Structures are given as C-alpha cells and as structure tokens.
Symmetry: C2
Subunit: 171 residues, 2 copies
Amino acid sequence: KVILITGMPGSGKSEFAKLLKERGAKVIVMSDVVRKRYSIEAGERLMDFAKRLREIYGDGVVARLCVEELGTSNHDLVVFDGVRSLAEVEEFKRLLGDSVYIVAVHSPPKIRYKRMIERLSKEISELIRRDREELKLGIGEVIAMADYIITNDSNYEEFKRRCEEVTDRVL
Amino acid sequence: KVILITGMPGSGKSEFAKLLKERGAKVIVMSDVVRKRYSIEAKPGERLMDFAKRLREIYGDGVVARLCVEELGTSNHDLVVFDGVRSLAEVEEFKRLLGDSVYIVAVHSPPKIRYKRMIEEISELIRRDREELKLGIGEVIAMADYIITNDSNYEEFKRRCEEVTDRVL
C-alpha cells in the first residue's frame, strides 16, 4: 500500500511523514530525489532544474524517478512525500498499481505563512508568490482529488491523532 | 462576514449550505445566479457550462461573483453565504467587493465516494471533474480556511459543520 503525501508550502506534511517512517515505512522524499539528481546535472536553482526535467522528460517525470528510487525491494508501506500534480499521481498509479492513496495535509494560508516566517524570503509578498508557483504545478488538484485530508491549525498533539487515524483508516 | 462554500461535484456542498439556510443566514447559490443570467444572455442550446465559459471569456472569470454581489442587495450589511465558488478569480472579486472578512470553507469527498453518491457513466463524471478543476477549484480548496470532510454520517458531517460555522462566526 502506497501513500502519496501532498501539501502547500508551509503545511507541516513533513511531520506526517516523520510519523510514518517512525512506524516503519519506506519514505521517499520527492524533493530529495530531484535534489540527488541535481547533484548530477546543472536550469540553475533546484526550481528551474525540475522546470527543465518536466519540460524535457515529462509531465510527469519526477514520479518515475521516485519509483526508480524505490527498489523492486518489497515494502509494506511506501510513502512518497510531496506530489504536486495529477501527472505524478497517474505515473505512480501506473507504475505501482491500485493500493495508492492521496493524503493532503491541510493548513490555511495565514498559518502556513506564520509557520514559515518563523523558520530560523520572510516577506509576505514572496510567500504568496511561492504559493502561486506551487499552484501552477497542479498541487491544487492533487488536494481536490485526495482520498483523505488531514488539517492542522492548532496543536501538534491534535495533528498527531488525526494522523494516527487517517493512517489506520488506510492501513 | 462572508462564507464561501466550495466543493467538488459529488462533495455534498448542498448539505452544508442547507444547514446554514436552516439557521437563518441568506444563502446565494452561485449556479442559480448564473442560470438567471442564462435567461438574458444565453441563447438556443448553450449546455450551461458552455455559456458559463462564454461569460468568463467575455467579462473575465471573476464575473459570477460580480453577479452574485449584484443580487445581494448592495446595502445588505448582514452576513451572506455564497455557494459554491470555482475559481480564486471569484474569491478575489468577492473580497474586492465585500472586504476583508471573507471565508472559504470547503467540503471534501474522495472521488470514489463522490461518484457512488452521484450515481445513486463513470467516465462522464470524471470528465465533469476534469472540467471543474480546469476552473481552478483545486486552488480554491488548496487556499481554504476550513476543509470539512464528508465521509459517512450526516451526524458526523453536521457536527463538523457546526464546529466550523461557530469558529467562523
């Protein structure tokens, strides 16, 4: 069974993933796959690099790179962190099968902003832009077609439980 | 204060809009607003959406909201519920016409849930999503203040509706 994590910039979706690998699960972090491919070839910033990848290699491309990332190994839970489009989803589905679920981790802007702003690019203008950049990738649709949506304003202890549950209600 | 209800075609938006309707709040149904405009602007066939597109092509995809504010008697100082927005373009419009206190709430249902419902073929319903998302409803949901999910139980669905409404008010 596969879970794809999706979430807007400041969502905290990372904590959900931290939770899953702690309960033993293959977590593959999509941006580090691109990251690791960056280590290999030089657009200039991680951004424009993956801008070319989708432009040259496919809709589409990064999911493949993750599935290639995964071994033919054999895991109980495989977790792909940070889908951004229905392209990636289609790919995952095609490659991995039918036990693939979308979990969107939700948090309303004003929170995500204050969350990000407080990270030891702090101008509200730029955050709003970064959201738009992300929406232009298609993450919005990934959220719309989710199988589950965990929200979190409030309390980590809140968030934690809504996870424990959305996970088992899948598992 | 303004509540915007957004949701995908099978989501169960209506039930939330209903719940508020029943409370006392004035609800404007955006799609009904468009229909009324049909009567004037559309002609012969225009399979709704066909005319819904031509409207945005002609007055920019903010229009539906502008017509909903046109309805809502420009004096109406009391809280209003609009259901249901499709584009951030329209959220922008409402804000630019009704000010800061504007709230996007959204109802979620998994596609498989959403369809089993709407039926009670499949291809057609998936096209109707493809279309909806092409109106940027995805980003509206993405940028939602609240996202109430709609799994089993009107009872649990209702309880979550109150949680938000009260929070909102």
